[PDB]
Amino acid sequence: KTTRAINKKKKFVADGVFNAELHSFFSKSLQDAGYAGIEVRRTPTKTEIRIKATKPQQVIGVEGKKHKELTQFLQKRFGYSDDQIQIWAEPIKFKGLCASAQVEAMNYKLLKDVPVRLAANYIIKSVIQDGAKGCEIIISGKLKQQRAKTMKFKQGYMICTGQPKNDYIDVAVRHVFFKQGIMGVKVKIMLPYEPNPAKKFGVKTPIPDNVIIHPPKQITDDKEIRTAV
């Protein structure tokens, strides 16, 4: 009988907030390898965090540094050395399909002084390459001068508006520190339609318009006549 009973409302809201706590915790520290999300299965026995990244290798750490740093770090706020709170790092199969990742890639290139257009091109091409169905990049900021300015780079399709917007679209945005002020970098990868329950590509449900009309196939057969001899 787990300590205190709680309004499935009250306890659920608590659940969500905890998850959003973890998200800030990871993303803020795991700012090296493509961080993505967290499948958290909580049991009154074991809290299981599963970090999804483009570069899982980075999460585990060196000797096992980060892996322990994070697992321990959690133990510091909601500890339970009983291996209860155990972390796992998942591999993000198609790198170029994760926007959260690409932004970091872009965040890296920009701090290494790679010009803007040249920059974005590489990420966008690389994204479409990985199977994107449409990609866009936004970079608001003091683009090489006084006033602010907003740069836009777009390729292929894109779902601007609709409910399907959030379904076929991935969007992550980061702040890039400069001795200038700040750079805003938004990435909108538009995932491909995936009808295979046996695949981790993006979407699963078709686009609401996207209406195909399978043409009739071909047929042949036999007959069972009543012979005439």
């Binding site: 078709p206 996207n210 209406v211 009309i213 399978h214």
Partner: protein, 64 residues
């Protein structure tokens, strides 16, 4: 303001284009066909396509 999106029209056009023989003068029967015949995500949209596709059927009962 009952007008048809281009997509709605294209569908009805191409459906009729491929299955004319099979298509009936009854919406319900046709709607069933249209659904068994292709990928119409929205159940509602399916009808629109059939409701209109059925319309064309009666305009071909004319020829032009």
């Amino acid at each position: 303001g009952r007008v048809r999106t281009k997509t709605v029209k294209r569908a009805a056009k191409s459906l009729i284009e491929h299955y004319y023989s099979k298509l009936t003068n009854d919406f319900h029967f046709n709607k069933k066909i249209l659904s068994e015949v292709a990928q119409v995500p929205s159940k509602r949209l399916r009808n629109k396509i059939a409701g209109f596709a059925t319309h064309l059927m009666k305009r071909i009962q004319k020829g032009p």
